[PDB]
């Protein structure tokens, strides 16, 4: 009924590496949590909408003292929200005002790939404007942009870029939940930063290829915030934004809440919890009720001993209304008993990280599937010990969870996931399929592993049609650009991931 514990497996835990980064209570003065506005269309009808994302380099007051350099879109940290609709054709302008490339990720988007997609193989150079268009098919759900350069993607959402996406359906609209974007319903993108002297980020310093972790929490591009409830409920949009931190979430006096949503989709059921785990780039959307609380009251968010989001209780008007026992209905798409259970193996530590023995290779194609149909995944993690909890992601699609090791799925996967946690020694299995041609990452989204080369991808096709041909990008295109726009030779270049590749002997 109400759960109370962690669902993964604790002994795997982020929190028992040898070089684990505790999260220390900033000296910074609390403040209103920033909510991202909803960034403005450029026009917009009821079958339209026109948006121009920009991405640029800036600065932000985050600590006492001078602003740390910072990228953002359209904004100088972070992104403006981009609200998207079920079935509205959707024409968005990418425009690239940073000194170096980057790519444009529309993370858990069912778009075609490999350049609407925005990945490895979908740079934007600076300067230049690239015009993309689509009709998203999938139900309501918080998605979220980032940038995707391979590599490195770790130093681009460090810098920065990283923005909250909302997708909106009827059926969603429908529904009994709080819906006023930044009164009571609010992102909390959880982040970490390490600040060194005058309040500057330094990823390069920092570098780890097991996961980059800072000391100081940031929330929304905002450190030690609070929030004014001026509702009876509030609804949190939790986003994973961290580069590998692992979020054990729950409240002073385990205040319970009810997760409503999940990464692709509402939960078929909503489901209450009281201590709740993300690992990197899932998304979580949670009901909390604030009712047994005085006005002027303070509740705070924890993430194990440590506070996060402070909630200031204040006036409100009572709600009466309960969730319905059934958020959402799950077609589960049809397996073609022919094909056969796909194996993919995460396997590795630190700089050894790979899949299925192999570190990514921008220009090989790792697999294959036919569009349209359905295919069970086993997905392994072979850490052995007490090892890691890896985040497995797949571009291009949303699966289901069937199985963890034969068992149930944890409560809150039996809707529509694109990033799951697999312990060490398990295998999930889950049903996956591709509406879409074109080119797919899939990859443990700890984002120094995907730089360091835990990634592979596959070639989805129409088995009606001869083979198709990409343009995929080449490590000469990205060292020359890259050398060119930092003023260096390509032999002095450094990206987050090469040292992974480099030292274990290994071509990027
Ligand atoms: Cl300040
Ligand atoms: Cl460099
Ligand atoms: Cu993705
Ligand atoms: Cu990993």
């Keep these: 009924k109400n759960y109370t514990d962690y669902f993964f497996d604790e002994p795997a835990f982020d929190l028992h590496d040898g070089g684990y980064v505790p999260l220390e209570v900033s000296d910074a003065p609390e403040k209103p949590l920033n909510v991202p506005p909803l960034l403005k269309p450029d026009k917009e009808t009821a079958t339209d909408v026109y948006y121009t994302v920009t991405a640029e380099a800036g600065e932000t007051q985050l600590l006492p003292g001078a602003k740390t350099k910072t990228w953002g879109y359209n904004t100088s940290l972070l992104g403006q929200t981009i609200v998207y609709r079920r079935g509205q054709h959707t024409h968005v302008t990418l425009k690239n005002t940073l000194p170096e490339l980057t790519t444009f990720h529309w993370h858990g988007a069912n778009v075609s790939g490999p350049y609407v997609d925005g990945g490895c193989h979908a740079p934007v150079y600076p300067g230049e ?25 770790a ?17 969603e609209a429908s529904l009994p939940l709080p819906r006023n974007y930044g009164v009571d319903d609010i992102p909390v993108i959880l982040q970490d930063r390490r600040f060194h002297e005058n309040n500057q980020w330094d990823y390069r310093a920092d570098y780890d290829p097991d996961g980059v972790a800072g000391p100081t929490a940031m929330i929304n591009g905002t450190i030690n915030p609070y929030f004014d409830v001026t509702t009876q409920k509030v609804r949190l949009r939790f986003l994973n934004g961290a580069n590998r931190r692992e979020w054990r979430l729950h409240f002073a006096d385990d205040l319970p809440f009810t997760q409503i949503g999940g990464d692709g989709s509402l939960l078929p059921e909503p489901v209450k919890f009281t201590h709740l785990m993300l690992t990197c780039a899932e998304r979580a959307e949670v009901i909390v009720d604030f009712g047994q609380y005085h006005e002027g009251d303070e509740v705070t968010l924890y993430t194990d001993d440590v506070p996060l989001l402070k909630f200031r209780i204040h006036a409100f008007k009572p709600d009466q209304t309960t969730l319905p026992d059934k958020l959402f209905d799950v077609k589960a798409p049809v397996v073609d008993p022919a094909l056969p259970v796909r194996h993919v193996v995460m396997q590795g530590m630190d700089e050894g990280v790979a899949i299925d ?13 036919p569009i349209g149909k359905a295919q069970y995944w086993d997905v392994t993690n072979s850490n ?6 890896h985040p497995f992601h797949v571009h291009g699609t949303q ?12 409560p809150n996967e039996h809707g529509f996931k694109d990033t799951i946690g697999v312990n060490p020694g398990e295998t999930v299995r889950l049903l996956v399929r591709f509406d879409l041609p074109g080119v ?20 989805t096709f129409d088995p009606a049609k001869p083979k198709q041909e990409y343009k995929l990008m080449d490590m000469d295109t990205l060292m020359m650009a890259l050398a060119k726009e930092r003023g260096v030779k390509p032999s002095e270049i450094w990206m987050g991931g090469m040292q992974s590749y480099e030292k274990m002997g290994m071509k990027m």
């Design 357 to 369: 023995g192999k570190k990514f290779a921008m220009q090989r194609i790792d697999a294959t599937q």
């Design 440 to 459: 797919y990452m899939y990859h443990c989204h700890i984002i120094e592993h995907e730089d360091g080369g835990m990634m592979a991808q596959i070639e």
């Design 399 to 410: 699966f289901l969870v069937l199985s963890r090791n034969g068992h149930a799925p944890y």
């Design 155 to 171: 130093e681009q959402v460090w810098h920065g870029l990283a923005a909250m996406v909302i997708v909106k359906d009827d059926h």
């Design 384 to 389: 052995d010990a007490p090892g890691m909890v």
């Design 129 to 153: 404007s690239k015009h993309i268009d689509f009709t998203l098919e999938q139900p309501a759900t918080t998605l979220w942009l980032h940038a995707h350069p391979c590599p490195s993607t």
